[model samples]
Target: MAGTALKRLMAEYKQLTLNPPEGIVAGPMNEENFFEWEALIMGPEDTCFEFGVFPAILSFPLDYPLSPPKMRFTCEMFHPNIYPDGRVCISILHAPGDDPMGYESSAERWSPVQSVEKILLSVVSMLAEPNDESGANVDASKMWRDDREQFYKIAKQIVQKSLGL
Candidate 1:
């Protein structure tokens, strides 16, 4: 009763295990830990990240869904929308409220109705259309705007690494 978030997570937990989404995977850290899920997200095929499989962790708060989970890549990723620490800075994951920085609209930020499916979808879109203006990785942002070929080369290198896994 105390960990209702865990209970809801359990339902999603089962669904993901039984029917893993293409290009994405999610599971518990261990049998004893239900609140935390480790995920591996495959980059969309034919895009800059094609053949790349990025690893990340989805840490859910006790209030989850009602709030939102935290997703951060454990693998190294160079992108304007993703932080050096691998935290993704997208509209779907931002805290629900006015952007203190005034960069995002409240309508574009996170809401309870958004789910794991929506999160992954947004991440895919983020890769395709990074918001260079509000960059998490400034170097990547400049490179993204200045030279796209270099960005693709870097991405391809990461994809090659992913293939080795």
Candidate 2:
């Protein structure tokens, strides 16, 4: 059982540690357990979510790389793309043939060749620009659309809470 998936995940973890991108850091939560990873995604600059650092779990499947991992944030977030429970609803996380929301053809579906950095980058950019078309939280979507000022207010509280301020 410790064949392709294990090797691939180890390599991915090593690569992520070797050259982490700005605003993101990801690795295994425990050295003995390789399937579940923990990461901190610093909020994107110039966005409402800025000045905040969000923690999340990048849970990999038994057959990873062949399938993308699921990313769930462990912090309170009030963005349109982030589910209330903190599941990120980005296109890159979705494997091919699983378009339950019917993402556009241009959406980048997860593939075996993609790296963990790709997912993190998508998440950072997602914070900067949320896609309202496919709303993970319909109420958040409505607020993002019609009540930007209120949205900004709630965002400030979340950002403050994220900082424990």
Candidate 3:
């Protein structure tokens, strides 16, 4: 199983190198390790996160494909679906099965068919439209739903900070 996972990872790596996805770039942190990856996700267009570039890490389990990789932002992220400490909370990242919270359907959860590209794309969409009903950052969720302007302001500040402006 490990061998098959490694092979899949390698193939995915090659595909990414050849045809990288728009608004995202990701690869192993180094050649010596395939389980750890570094990523840069460009915020989706016309959203609060637009014009921002966020850095993150993706760590795969040894039994990948059977399980989903974990992703966390390395940079400051103020979002309803991203924890204060940086862990990302999204349906696609959840394990395959019935939702414990009943907020997600089994089809929305992770499956072996999901790839790294899919995860990142989903994340971009997540940033553009947060699931405030099932939030990780309560403050962000409240701000997002109550005061969208304030949310945009805060997100812009973080974007400026990320750009060292």
Candidate 4:
């Protein structure tokens, strides 16, 4: 399983490096380790995360594609779908199977066909519009829903900080 995962990861890494996606860049942190990757995502336009450049890490399981990789922001992320410590709570990163929690459909869950590109794309979408229903960061969710201005202010601070501005 690890062999298969390694091959796929390498292919994905090569593809990403060759033809990077818009507003997203990712590759293995160490050339020797294909299972660990680092990513930089530019915030989506017209969203609170706009102009922000967030850094994150992706750690793939030994049986990846069978099990989704885990993504955690290396920079601060204050969002309903992002834990305080930076773990993301998107459905695509969930284990491959039916949602026992019943929050997502099987189609939305992890699948072998899903690539790092897809994951990062989903993450960008997550930052643009967090899923408050799950509320990984309760405070963020509360502010996003009850006090949007405050949420936007804080998000702007993070974006500025990310830019060293």
Candidate 5:
């Protein structure tokens, strides 16, 4: 039966509940199925995204720890690293050889040793320091580069929307 994978997820769910991280809410969407999770992450400190709240869905596979979850932002995310469609483009969320890009570099990637805690932290880091090289959102990347003030302005508007509704 495909139970061991879920056992691991159950244990992790409890672990996070016991000691939640600094800036995120992590858990499965439903009790019956542990294959998908929802993450509500607060903006990283000192960044343009600060004070903003973002929601994302992380869909898991039965392979679990062996495979990485695909995080899709449900909220409006105008970051240079987040795709226009809301898929977060980062190395930790990708496989070592999947190579979403040609220059991914030799950085930490998803593996059995990684955990949800680390994954959330990595997202916070991504928000804190975007690697514009990836440029998941072309216009966002250029706006972030050319008109720094404009980028911050949009970020604030996004933050307002996140709280308004």
Candidate 6:
């Protein structure tokens, strides 16, 4: 029997394949490996990340709906919420629970209701405006807070480099 999480993922995957989100393309890594996925997200218009085609990976656990999947950008992205190790630190990706850090509420944590579309939108938003106060990359957060222009310049450059431009 397919687990609830797998069922939901399959349904979402089918829906996305039938009607993919604008500026977003995602699919399982392979027919046999449904647990892992690779995605390409075009930065939304009017955002600092715009025009950049960013890539990311999604790894879901066997007991998925009970636990949140982990996401990491394969493309280099400069954001306070993204760790140097490539993991993203977003509330929706956080495990459901009372935050010992007191930084997030249960409502913000991952839930079955949260779909792949929502998660990608959040990542796009994170690329536009990082949460410096609650940062995973301290250096980037400090740079973003202190020198906004420089931060944008570097970020834009990274995007350009991704395009080989």
The CA lDDT of each predicted structure is 0.75, 0.79, 0.80, 0.81, 0.80, 0.76
Candidate 5 vs candidate 6: the TM-score winner is 5
User: Which regions in candidate 4 have their CA more than 4 angstroms from the true location?
Assistant: 96-107
Candidate 6 local lDDT, 1-165, one digit each (tens): 247878878987998988788877889898677788889878777766788888888997877767778888886677776776767777668776634444656356777658888788777666666665357777788888899998888788877866767
Residue pairs of candidate 5 with colliding backbone atoms: none
Clashes of each: 0, 0, 0, 0, 0, 0
TM-score (all chains, Cα) for each model: 0.86, 0.90, 0.90, 0.89, 0.89, 0.88
Off by over 4 Å in 1: 98-102, 131-133
Local accuracy of candidate 2 as per-residue lDDT tens digits, 35-149: 8888988888998888888888988777776877778888768777767777887677876666667666566687764878877888888888866636777789999899899
Q: After superposition, how far is residue 142 of candidate 1 from its true place, in Å?
A: 1.1
lDDT tens readout by residue for model 4, 48-126: 8899998888888787767777888887789887778788777777765534444656356666658888888988877
Candidate 3 least-lDDT 10 residues: 98-107
Model 1 clash pairs are: none
Best by lDDT: 4
Q: What is the TM-score (0 to 1) of candidate 1?
A: 0.86
Q: How well does candidate 4 score on lDDT at residue 96?
A: 53
On residues 45-128, what C-alpha lDDT tens digit does candidate 3 reach at each position? 888788888989988788877877778988768888777788887778877563454564635777775878888888988878
How many pairs of residues in model 2 come into backbone collision? 0
Off by over 4 Å in 5: none
Indicate the TM-score of model 2: 0.90
Error of 1 at 128 (Å): 3.8
Question: Looking at candidate 5, what is the lDDT of residue 135?
Answer: 76
